[PDB]
Symmetry: D2
Subunit: 259 residues, 4 copies
Amino acid sequence: HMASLNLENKTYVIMGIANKRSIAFGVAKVLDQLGAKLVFTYRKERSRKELEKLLEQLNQPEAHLYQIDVQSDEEVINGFEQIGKDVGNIDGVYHSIAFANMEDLRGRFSETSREGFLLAQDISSYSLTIVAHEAKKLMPEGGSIVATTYLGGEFAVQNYNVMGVAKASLEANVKYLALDLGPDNIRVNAISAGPIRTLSAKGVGGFNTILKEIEERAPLKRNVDQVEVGKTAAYLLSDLSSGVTGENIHVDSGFHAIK
Amino acid sequence: MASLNLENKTYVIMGIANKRSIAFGVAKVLDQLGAKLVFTYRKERSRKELEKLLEQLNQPEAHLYQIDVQSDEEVINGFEQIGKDVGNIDGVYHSIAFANMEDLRGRFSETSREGFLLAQDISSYSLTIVAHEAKKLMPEGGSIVATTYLGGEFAVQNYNVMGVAKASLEANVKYLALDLGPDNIRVNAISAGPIRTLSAKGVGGFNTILKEIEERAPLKRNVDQVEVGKTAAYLLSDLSSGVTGENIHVDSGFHAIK
Amino acid sequence: HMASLNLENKTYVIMGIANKRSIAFGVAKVLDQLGAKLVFTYRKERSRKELEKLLEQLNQPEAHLYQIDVQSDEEVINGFEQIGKDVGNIDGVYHSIAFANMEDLRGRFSETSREGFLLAQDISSYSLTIVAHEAKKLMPEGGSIVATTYLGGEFAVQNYNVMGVAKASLEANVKYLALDLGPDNIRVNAISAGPIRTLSAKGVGGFNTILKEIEERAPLKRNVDQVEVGKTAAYLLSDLSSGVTGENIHVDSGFHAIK
Amino acid sequence: GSHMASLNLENKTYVIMGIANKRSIAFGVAKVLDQLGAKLVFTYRKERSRKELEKLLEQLNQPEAHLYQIDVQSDEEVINGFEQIGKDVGNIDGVYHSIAFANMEDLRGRFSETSREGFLLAQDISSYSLTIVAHEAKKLMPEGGSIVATTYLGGEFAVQNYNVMGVAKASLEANVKYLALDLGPDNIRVNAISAGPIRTLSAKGVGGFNTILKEIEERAPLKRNVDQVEVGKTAAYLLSDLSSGVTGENIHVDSGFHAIK
Ligand SMILES: NC(=O)C1=CN([C@@H]2O[C@H](COP(=O)(O)OP(=O)(O)OC[C@H]3O[C@@H](n4cnc5c(N)ncnc54)[C@H](OP(=O)(O)O)[C@@H]3O)[C@@H](O)[C@H]2O)C=CC1
Ligand SMILES: NC(=O)C1=CN([C@@H]2O[C@H](COP(=O)(O)OP(=O)(O)OC[C@H]3O[C@@H](n4cnc5c(N)ncnc54)[C@H](OP(=O)(O)O)[C@@H]3O)[C@@H](O)[C@H]2O)C=CC1
Ligand SMILES: NC(=O)C1=CN([C@@H]2O[C@H](COP(=O)(O)OP(=O)(O)OC[C@H]3O[C@@H](n4cnc5c(N)ncnc54)[C@H](OP(=O)(O)O)[C@@H]3O)[C@@H](O)[C@H]2O)C=CC1
Ligand SMILES: NC(=O)C1=CN([C@@H]2O[C@H](COP(=O)(O)OP(=O)(O)OC[C@H]3O[C@@H](n4cnc5c(N)ncnc54)[C@H](OP(=O)(O)O)[C@@H]3O)[C@@H](O)[C@H]2O)C=CC1
Ligand SMILES: C=C(CC/C=C\C=C\C[C@H](C)CC(=O)C[C@@H](O)CNC(=O)[C@H](C)[C@@H](C)OC(N)=O)C[C@@H](C)C/C(C)=C/C(=O)O
Ligand SMILES: C=C(CC/C=C\C=C\C[C@H](C)CC(=O)C[C@@H](O)CNC(=O)[C@H](C)[C@@H](C)OC(N)=O)C[C@@H](C)C/C(C)=C/C(=O)O
Ligand SMILES: C=C(CC/C=C\C=C\C[C@H](C)CC(=O)C[C@@H](O)CNC(=O)[C@H](C)[C@@H](C)OC(N)=O)C[C@@H](C)C/C(C)=C/C(=O)O
Ligand SMILES: C=C(CC/C=C\C=C\C[C@H](C)CC(=O)C[C@@H](O)CNC(=O)[C@H](C)[C@@H](C)OC(N)=O)C[C@@H](C)C/C(C)=C/C(=O)O
């Protein structure tokens, strides 16, 4: 077969599950159903307890969980060396990690703090660069890296503020990584997801406003879910997307195409 | 959920001419995944080739239809007839462009009014009318994919009138996506890198562009019809649910660099 | 050389004045105040009567008016040969011409007629290609060509339908012309104007809706006028914009930058 | 207030951040704004830049040299610098931002090898600087005004060897858009100029810069490179009221290279 979505014999690291609503979990459910071996990474202990509870919903024989705060060079370097020891070589990484201080997001963008801006950049963009460098060690045959972005990296959207500049950074990060790791047969791409109700998104002002605008104005007149992101993640992580790199696929009911 | 099993799916494929046609790469891939395939052609030469090619495939019943997309009638009748012979479809792959060599050889400012509107008619408007008629056979929803080139987004040497046609096509895709979205019809494009085809063979310095892709593109290699077919499988299937008005570059990353 | 907006000794052809509200007239008022010699082109006789009435508002010694319907190779070729005879060599052309059948604009975009689509393409896009070819004859030293576009060429906007695909065609036309005529020191650029109340725009459904959305959502929280387009036209037509070609400048209160 | 279109900048005052020597893009902006009769305030980091500025001001027609030391890495130097400009010359009509930096270690490397410290440094100087400069300069622009920052194509496309600075420029370009939306209601316009390659102090002695200069001459529509003055001309347009109604825009002053592939 030329075209295949059979991921038995494939191993993927999934960074950024927090609870059942996490986009990264949508990616996990889908990759699991297609028979991939899945390694998971988390920051907080609360995410670990949830992960173990969630793995029962999946068909992963062995829970391989690793604590990686992407703010620490060491936790990232050691985390990936340790994954290499425990499961061997991998076929890709799904990156589902962002953070900004609520103080900066609530503010006017011009009021953003130097510390808040560099924090958003560090977690939401630089993380992908170091994750890529370490994961490359486990992908000598080649593989696929995917990161999660939002329209706010391409256009100034109300309230996204500092995270918009972080996502623009991430999106350019993807392109520079694609050009750098291409000759090593490593593809780097992004999924621009439409708004999804998650732990991160719950209790940020006017999120219900954007959900309703998508239903009313977006071509498909509906919102997307974690599984739809997972399906496009399957395409980008598998060899189905061979010849695609430096690309940004909008899984957003067509909202990106309209004005 | 996630599936590349396309048994019980039916797709119309417009624009096979020979074994090198991008549309044939799409056919080979969709066939392997178990889809029922309807084919459309213009010239009789394409029909003879299609029948010879269908032996390479596992299609029980050869359903072939003559549609020159310049004729409202051939398009309207072609699709009504497909609806009668096989019933409702799940999508259309559009693999059709043409411009006069006179216009392509020229300086773009020398382009003829007739040559410009011809390129627009075949290469862009075709998708609008194909979409209108195919919508009749997709009352549950479906996916339409058209084939474009980077030259629709940037001025490329020698693409001339076809660049303005592809920019037209790419905007066509977006307006169709917004129009047919509420009918649960997705409309997307694949921006293929350079591939040696019947259409492309015997346009000067095509080997030069192939070598520039190998040297400068991130993956340091060219793409083929099957790689387009793989991305077509994604866009035509429900794997790409929630993706519409999108342009996916199957071009080894060339679009991302300068 | 050093920076000047003094356009005495410069001559510009302005295509597409119809009445006092025409964007092209905003361009004329501005270029006139800066002391340029202005040649004008029109289609209908109604536009000629209006032009002569309007020229009294300007400081053009000699009225040079020419009938050019851009659908006719002959009217365009002869028009420009005749301009070359009557005023000699020119420094640029401002293109302010578009048209589609209201039947096509009122419809669903998928219902668009083959004749209506090619009509929109012919007047709204191809016109620039042949205008450029003939005007090049009068610009052996070099010059600047500017065409007028709308955001609907970059994004699917409700109700713009066939004219959006025409503007995308125009915008690509600008790029290919810029690459072709660049070596002849001819610059080709576009202005993406925000919504303006004109003869063409008056009595097309939901135009008041877009005007109000611009005031509410656009960065500058206001609409633009013909003169603001004229000011940016002065920049693009003069040597102030040397080194700028294949560019699309949005004169739209920042609406293009947001989502 | 008689010509609708005007490039006469007598009675206008502009802060110009990032002159280092005669080759600096910011100096091209200065020469042009000066010729049009603007009052110019200048900002620098190193003392070497101050000595050069004083030597350069003789080439201009600025009666009183107003020079201020602002390292954009320091909230204090930026806040105090702008308060002090407000005291010495009063309200301003805009800011030209011509400031970027990355460690040569990071630029020479493979982009995937980039250090966390090097990445955040590039972001801090090359992008965040504009956000805080904008916040403080807004205090001196209660009537409104225009802010322009300098970027390169490498913020929009992966270009060989630009590495971490490409991600910094993409950050800057998004910064411009978010600033445009935030400060628009205060009648402050925020725009970028994407300059083609120019021989400057910053650019001199980075490998393969001569390669890109030659590729521009061969492949770009105008078949020629641009200079600091051409950037200055487009800066005059963006800084003056000639560009009224333009904000969140990125104007390529690059002989059309951005339009081709
Ligand atoms: N929800 C949405 O609408 C959209 C989200 N996205 C993007 O999708 C991705 C995931 O978001 P979403 O699923 O909503 O939110 P979640 O609540 O799942 O994600 C937050 C995740 O980020 C992890 N995280 C944050 N900081 C760090 C760090 N320093 N080190 C390691 N992990 C960290 C969290 O771990 P812990 O809790 O253990 O700290 C958690 O797993 C993000 O990049 C987001 O920007 C894109 C478009 C839309
Ligand atoms: N080759 C390349 O590098 C790239 C090609 N593309 C695009 O891919 C698509 C297919 O290209 P390629 O595979 O080279 O094409 P081929 O020339 O191998 O196939 C082209 C098809 O267009 C059909 N066609 C032409 N005119 C009409 C018409 N008036 N009515 C109906 N069908 C028509 C031809 O049929 P017939 O012979 O019967 O006229 C032929 O089947 C085109 O849109 C092209 O622009 C995009 C990027 C790259
Ligand atoms: N108004 C708006 O909000 C916006 C308009 N635009 C674009 O701006 C440009 C100017 O439009 P606007 O000022 O509204 O239009 P006008 O109100 O000036 O009316 C249309 C103009 O088009 C000319 N025209 C139409 N067909 C032909 C032809 N075949 N040959 C020559 N001239 C022709 C008309 O001449 P006549 O009637 O004398 O034949 C007239 O001058 C257009 O290209 C338009 O799409 C862009 C953004 C916004
Ligand atoms: N040259 C080119 O080819 C192009 C350059 N650009 C961009 O134009 C801008 C200026 O470029 P160019 O003329 O080449 O640069 P120059 O090096 O000639 O000037 C660079 C300036 O950055 C200043 N600078 C560096 N760090 C800081 C800091 N922490 N605080 C304040 N100022 C600082 C330097 O001042 P000091 O040395 O005193 O610290 C210097 O004035 C940059 O944004 C660059 O990215 C864009 C396109 C092309
Ligand atoms: C324009 C949108 C509307 C909402 C405004 C801002 C959204 C910012 C998203 C950003 C990722 C949120 C945070 O950084 C959250 C953090 O400050 C507080 N929350 C937490 O710490 C929770 C417990 C954990 C899970 O947080 C994290 N991230 O670890 C953007 C919307 C409409 C689209 C979105 C949400 C895009 C995106 O997620 O990037
Ligand atoms: C920049 C590129 C270099 C190639 C330049 C021009 C090619 C344009 C493609 C266009 C579709 C070619 C024709 O229409 C060919 C036609 O005029 C003569 N040939 C035929 O009629 C044959 C018999 C039939 C089968 O061809 C057709 N089309 O019916 C673009 C290259 C790098 C990539 C390409 C080929 C892009 C594209 O196809 O759009
Ligand atoms: C979303 C928008 C609302 C308006 C929708 C479609 C407008 C298209 C513009 C197009 C040029 C209008 C026509 O062709 C009008 C024509 O059908 C009838 N009127 C005329 O013929 C008059 C007499 C003459 C002068 O008109 C012409 N052109 O010949 C788009 C809006 C928000 C933005 C606009 C108005 C863009 C634009 O005008 O291009
Ligand atoms: C892709 C291009 C080819 C060259 C590659 C990288 C150039 C990056 C520009 C960057 C801003 C320069 C530095 O950070 C150099 C710095 O580390 C060493 N120089 C200095 O420290 C001097 C003393 C000071 C004055 O300079 C600064 N800036 O602090 C990009 C080229 C073709 C276009 C350019 C140069 C764009 C740009 O400058 O942004």
